[PDB]
Structure formats: structure tokens, C-alpha cells
Design a protein around this ligand. Structure first.
Ligand SMILES: Nc1ncnc2c1ncn2[C@@H]1O[C@H](COP(=O)(O)CP(=O)(O)OP(=O)(O)O)[C@@H](O)[C@H]1O
Ligand SMILES: Nc1ncnc2c1ncn2[C@@H]1O[C@H](COP(=O)(O)CP(=O)(O)OP(=O)(O)O)[C@@H](O)[C@H]1O
Ligand code: MET
Ligand code: MET
Ligand SMILES: [K+]
Ligand SMILES: [K+]
Ligand SMILES: [Mg+2]
Ligand SMILES: [Mg+2]
Ligand SMILES: [Mg+2]
Ligand SMILES: [Mg+2]
Ligand SMILES: [Mg+2]
Lengths: 392, 389
């Protein structure tokens, strides 16, 4: 049986880049809760004892940027210089201005353009992907790395591993077989975790606890064997973490946000962006398309690209590829996708309910990936029925 | 003839995200020039009247961060509030500290580990890609978007289009034919440019000038026809730009830095990173491997993944896929790539000469893409001979 090794990583919510995504999306949530028509382009960065929120917001909302920043950091567990950032000591810089009027006239006519006439908030390209290899129609390498990172957070919060600190990363190498273009996981080859820790725990205790409390409960037993490789805190010490160890920025985890290196990426970040930014609304809709093609049994795997021009409602290009797993030709799947899905940003916003913030609607997307989640707020995970001649 | 549409974009050196990449790599260059063993992790961000350099540097170098920032902005053409940032008046913030000692012990033993023992400076995965569809073994959608963006900067600087301002973007949609897994460009479907401009030029003049001075000189005539679509400054006004129009950050153009959506990306940014950061040295080596497989005639297309753990010299995984274009099996190409290439970071650094800064060695990688360039400083663009039958 010929196989190959494919690797995906993740980080948890205490990773300093993920912190920035969550602050950017906490700001988006706060704007939309008061003004659903908010134009939001909120970037965040962090380093030792410093968070800065910067970029462009036009909102009728009254927003306390400082509070949102400190509250977000506090909830993730950045509550002392000892764990790499103190939410209640750190400098909070704010360099927020209104959206460029040159952008605003072209995109939405300063909040006068009707939904079907709203232009793309910028140019770019976006991909959606789905694979039948997991029930959430996501790649197993990604899913396993992601769920391990979430389990790492959970055993700190639930008091199972009292020695953990917020900042952690994971990486899973899966051995795969190609079944007529479909991806069939064989076994997990290598599992890696690097997690921040206090000074009370030995490397033997870290290794024991990570294997028993974190990795074993998440990876299906059928994928683990006596030859599976384990790298557990390979640096040998990870006491210094969060912004103290490593500068964070919004949009530096776009592959961890998406498909772990499977499918494709157009390069646009998600977090801190209102849905006129097709970086977000476009990627969500082409995930809905890719997932719908696979969930309807039209294909075992699907990749969809869309592209846009700033100020133009209609996409410049659309493609569908099923890696030869389609039960009808890709040209016919492309025709069905284009008849079923409205790629116009004004339409995507309403059709996926993307102007709703609050109850951390977008903050939830900013850690543990945007795709393959079952929370009803993830509206682009809802499968659309597709009209086709489905085999008996 | 059955075809499909594939789109790639670019931005030029005046795009605020690309400005950040160039500042981050200007800081790397400046450190390496004095201290080749500099540990550099320099992030940059920018918004109206403000640039900030932040992250971690351990260097024996004496560095003027403010001068490097202002010189980099000045050279790109950010010389007034009128064109979106004033290199001589903007606030320059600096939050640079030394590398975490916890990282330093694990990666390089505080500058004591020998090359073969240097660990990956972090975990992660990187892909390299090559395609025989262009002489540079890069995807045509990416190459055309990139070369159009570079021509856009050129006609501003050389005084061909004097209305231009530094900040511009491109996108090209190519109609492709699949030839048994190989990619064969048929024609250019859609060309888009959005460029910053002064108040002295009409939208009709912009469209005329961009077609005649920027697009026509770059796109091969064989790819352009009467049905090619043009979007030329479709927003209708792009007077405000650079940091004034839009916040920039290092590492927010990783697809424009690489293959324009072709192949794959592991998510690691390049700019501001010394070569112990396998995000950079790992991506460079797997581009060299993918390109070498294609240039040796082993395949018409090649994707190579490598992955690492922090502190471990040897990669955790390697894969080769030729999209069914391989003339020998992918398992055998993987065996030749692993016998030919040394993926240990301490060895990659020396083998690609990545500790040399100066004459903007890394600053030049920080706009117009890291791959498919002819400049001899792009050491990873050198084809290695591969032994096969
Ligand atoms: N008035 C205008 N009309 C058209 N384009 C404009 C414009 N003002 C600015 N732009 C361009 O649009 C660019 C934005 O590109 P991106 O950086 O791709 C946006 P982003 O939302 O930060 O997404 P990213 O995640 O891809 O960085 C600006 O930096 C500039 O080149
Ligand atoms: N001592 C240590 N041992 C192991 N891991 C550590 C560590 N100190 C920090 N790390 C982890 O390594 C992370 C670095 O993750 P990344 O953000 O991927 C690095 P980067 O150079 O910024 O690349 P990027 O482009 O992927 O963002 C830190 O944020 C932290 O989680
Ligand atoms: C076209 S620049 C990208 C969007 C811009 N940041 C805004 O505020 O809408
Ligand atoms: C493992 S954290 C990423 C690297 C870090 N910025 C450094 O200073 O080396
Ligand atoms: K960093
Ligand atoms: K931005
Ligand atoms: Mg990072
Ligand atoms: Mg106060
Ligand atoms: Mg973009
Ligand atoms: Mg940007
Ligand atoms: Mg990384």
C-alpha cells in the first residue's frame, strides 16, 4: 500500500497571534452589536507589556477599545507578567481612524448602495475546501491538531493540568492513502505539542500529562500505534510565553484558520473584518459551496476559488475542482455551484447573517479555526441542498 | 477544449503590508551586515503617521531602527502626508527586546550549537512548488500579476506615468488547460489593476495609461485577445493610500510572497526572520527541491512539504507529489530529494548562504515575490542536479 505523510499544526487561544485575532474580532463583535452596518478593519499587535489596536472603523457604535482589549486578554488568562502579559498592567495603544472615503464611496456609496449593488470591499481570491475523511468534512491532519490545541486549553481551565499556561501549539503528521483522488487516513505518524508551563512541573510530568490527558482522549485509538512518534515540549523549557516570548499580530494564522495546508488559500486574513471584506464573506461562502458539493454526495473532495475587484459586486472568476472524485463532471458542478450560490458581497452578508455580532459571534471563529465547527453561529457550515441526478 | 479559470494577485512595494515586509527585512539585512549570527524576529506595522518595529532581536550589531524605517519608507516614495506617509515626519515606535532565553537554549544553545545540531527555531510546515508553464518554473497567473505590479512601480519611478503614487495592486485570471496533470495557460481572461494616483488625472487617462504603459509591455501578446476583460481602478478614486488608507503588518502577503494560490502554503511569514526560522529557510529549500525535480525533467509539476519541531534538527515529515506528471514514481523522487537536500536548518543556512545581509539581500525578497527571480542572491533558485534514470 503506497502512502505519504501530510502535516498540519494548530495553536490554542493563548498563542499571541491568536490573541490578536480574538481582540480584532472582539472589536468587530462590539461594533456590530450596536451598529450592524459597521465598517470594521481592526488590526491588533502585541509584544511585552503592549497591545495596539489599529486600522479603520466607521460605526455609530460607542466603543471602549481599551476595555475590549483588557477584557479579551483577561479571559484568555493573560493576568500576570508571570504568564507573559498582564491585561491590567499592559500599555493599550489605539490608532483607529474612519474608513477612507475613497474606499467607502466605491464599496457601499457611504451606506447608500442596495445589497445587490454593494461592491467587493477589495480585490483578491478565496478558496473553499471539503473532504469526506471526517464527519465535519475537514482534513484529519488539521482537525486532530486543532482539537488537541482545544483539549490543551480545556485541561488548564478545568484544573486537570494545573501546571499549564495559556500559550500552546500542536502539530500532527498523518499517513494518507490516495483512493481515486479521495484522502484516506491510515495512521497518525508524529504528534507534537509545545505548551507554556509553570516552574512546578518536570519534563517527565509534562510528557505523561500531555499524552494521557490531552493527546489520547482526542486522537481515535484506531490511528495510534506503538510506532507513532511523540515530540512533547522538545525545546526543553517553555516558561516565558505569550507576547513576552513572541510578538503577535492579526492574520498570521490564516492556514490554522482554514484547512491546515490542504485545498488552497488566497492569502486574505479573516479576523477584525466586517463582511464587505470578501476575504471573510467570500471564504465563508466557498467553504459552504465545497462542503455542500461533498455533503450532497456529488464528490469525496472539492476545491472552489472565487475572486473579486474592489467596487464590483460580481466575482471575476469561479472554479471547482474535485481532484477526480466528482460523480458528475467538474464543469457541471461549476454550473450547479454558480446557479445555487450568490457570490455578491451584499447578498452573502444577508444570506449568512454576517452583520450579527454579540454573544462573541465572531470572537468564537478567531480560535480553533473558522471551518468544521457545529455552533449555529457558523452559518457557512450549513449544507445547502443541490439539484442533480443523485445515484440510486 | 475544456478549460478552467485560476486567479492570482500581487501588490507592489508601496502597498502598506509590503512596506512592513520590506522594513522587517531591512532590519534583518542591517543586523546580518554587522553580526551574521543575529537572531532576528522583527515585526512591523503601520497606520496614519505611524510605523512600529516590534519583536525579538539578539545581535552584536549597533542598529538605528528609526533610520532603517525612514530610509525604507523614503526609497519606496512615502515622502509626504499627500502620498499616504511622510518618511521624515511619521512617528517611529520601537518595542524590540532580546530573544526569549527559553527559545535560545532550545534552538542554538545560546550560540553554542554546531550547524548539524541547530534545531528548528519553531514547529511548522512549508511547501515548495514548481511548474514547467513558465521559464522561471512558476505559475503564469502569479508571474503576470507580479511582473505587472513591478512594471506599475517602474513607470512611476522612471517618469512614464507621473500621476502614479506608490500603493498599487494587480490581479490576473488565466484560462488553463490540464494536460495529464500539467498546467497549460490558454489566454488571459481578466486583468485588474488598482493604483494610487494624484488629483491631476482622469479615470479615462488612468485606464489608457495602465493598458499602454503597464499591461501591454508585460503580458505576452499570445495570451491577450479581444475578449480579455479589463478592470482599471474600478473603485473610481484611489487618491488616499499607503498607511493613510489601510493599516499594514509584516507577513500579511504570504501567498503573494509564494505561488499565488498554486501549490500550498504552511502559513509561515518570511520577512524579518533569520534562517533559524525554518518558515524562511525551510520554504527556500523546498522551492529549490520542487524546482530541481521539474528542471531535471523528472516531472512537469512538483509539490514538496517539510515540517519541523522546535529544537529538532531533522524534519518530522517530507512529501513529494507530482500531480501525476512524474516520469518515475513519487516514492522514488522523495528518496532522491532526501538523499540530495539537507533539511537541517544549520545546514540549510550554510548551503544557501542565508547569513549574508547587505546590498538589500533580504529587502529585495520582501517585494515582487521570494521565488522565480534571477538575482544571484536568490540562492534557492539555483537548480541542483538529481541522479536518476
Ligand atoms: N480607494 C481605494 N480604491 C481601491 N483600492 C484601494 C483604495 N485604497 C486602498 N486600496 C488598496 O487596497 C489595499 C488593501 O489590500 P489588502 O492588504 O489585501 C486589505 P486587508 O483587509 O488588510 O487584507 P489582507 O489580509 O489581504 O491584508 C490597500 O493597501 C491599497 O493598495
Ligand atoms: N520556549 C519555547 N518553546 C517552545 N515553543 C515556544 C517557546 N516560546 C514560544 N514558543 C511558541 O512558539 C510560538 C511561535 O509561533 P509562530 O507565530 O508560528 C512563530 P512566527 O515566527 O511569528 O511565525 P508565523 O509567521 O507562523 O507567525 C510562540 O507564540 C509560542 O506559542
Ligand atoms: C481596500 S483597502 C482594505 C479595506 C480597508 N482597510 C477598509 O477600511 O475598508
Ligand atoms: C518559537 S517563538 C518564534 C520565534 C521567536 N520570535 C524568536 O525570537 O526566535
Ligand atoms: K512573532
Ligand atoms: K488592513
Ligand atoms: Mg507569529
Ligand atoms: Mg485607565
Ligand atoms: Mg488582500
Ligand atoms: Mg492588508
Ligand atoms: Mg508559525
Amino acid at each position: 500500500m503506497e502512502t505519504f505523510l501530510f502535516t498540519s499544526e494548530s495553536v490554542n487561544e493563548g498563542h499571541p497571534d491568536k490573541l490578536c485575532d480574538q481582540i480584532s474580532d472582539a472589536v468587530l463583535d462590539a461594533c456590530l452589536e450596536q451598529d450592524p452596518d459597521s465598517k470594521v478593519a481592526c488590526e491588533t499587535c502585541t509584544k511585552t507589556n503592549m497591545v495596539m489596536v489599529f486600522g479603520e472603523i466607521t460605526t455609530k457604535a460607542t466603543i471602549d477599545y481599551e476595555k475590549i482589549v483588557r477584557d479579551t486578554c483577561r479571559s484568555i488568562g493573560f493576568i500576570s507578567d508571570d504568564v507573559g502579559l498582564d491585561a491590567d498592567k499592559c500599555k493599550v495603544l489605539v490608532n483607529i481612524e474612519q474608513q477612507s472615503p475613497d474606499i467607502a464611496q466605491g464599496v457601499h456609496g457611504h451606506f447608500t448602495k442596495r445589497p445587490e449593488d454593494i461592491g467587493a470591499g477589495d480585490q483578491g481570491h478565496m478558496f473553499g475546501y471539503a473532504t469526506d475523511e471526517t464527519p465535519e468534512l475537514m482534513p484529519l491532519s488539521h482537525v486532530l491538531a486543532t482539537k488537541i490545541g482545544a483539549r490543551l486549553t480545556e485541561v488548564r481551565k478545568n484544573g486537570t493540568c494545573r501546571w499549564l499556561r495559556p500559550d500552546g501549539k500542536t502539530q500532527v503528521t498523518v499517513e494518507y492513502y490516495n483512493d481515486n483522488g479521495a484522502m484516506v487516513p491510515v495512521r497518525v505518524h508524529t504528534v507534537l505539542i509545545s505548551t507554556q508551563h509553570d516552574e512546578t512541573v518536570t519534563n517527565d510530568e509534562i510528557a505523561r500529562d500531555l499524552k494521557e490527558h490531552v493527546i489520547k482522549p482526542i486522537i481515535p485509538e484506531k490511528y495510534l500505534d506503538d510506532k507513532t512518534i511523540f515530540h512533547l515540549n522538545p525545546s526543553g523549557r517553555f516558561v516565558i510565553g505569550g507576547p513576552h516570548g513572541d510578538a503577535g499580530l492579526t492574520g498570521r494564522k490564516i492556514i490554522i484558520d482554514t484547512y491546515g495546508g490542504w485545498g488552497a488559500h488566497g492569502g486574505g486574513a479573516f479576523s477584525g473584518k466586517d463582511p464587505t471584506k470578501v476575504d471573510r464573506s467570500g471564504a465563508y461562502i466557498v467553504r459552504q459551496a465545497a462542503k455542500s458539493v461533498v455533503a450532497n454526495g456529488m464528490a469525496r473532495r472539492a476545491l472552489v476559488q472565487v475572486s473579486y475587484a474592489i467596487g464590483v459586486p460580481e466575482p471575476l472568476s469561479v472554479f471547482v475542482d474535485t481532484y477526480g472524485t466528482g460523480l458528475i463532471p467538474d464543469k457541471e458542478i461549476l454550473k450547479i455551484v454558480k446557479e445555487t450560490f450568490d457570490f455578491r458581497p451584499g447578498m452573502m452578508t444577508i444570506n449568512l447573517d454576517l452583520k450579527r455580532g454579540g454573544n462573541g459571534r465572531f470572537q468564537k471563529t478567531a480560535a480553533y479555526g473558522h471551518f468544521g465547527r457545529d455552533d449555529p453561529d457558523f452559518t457557512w457550515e450549513v449544507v445547502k441542498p443541490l439539484k442533480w441526478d443523485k445515484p440510486q
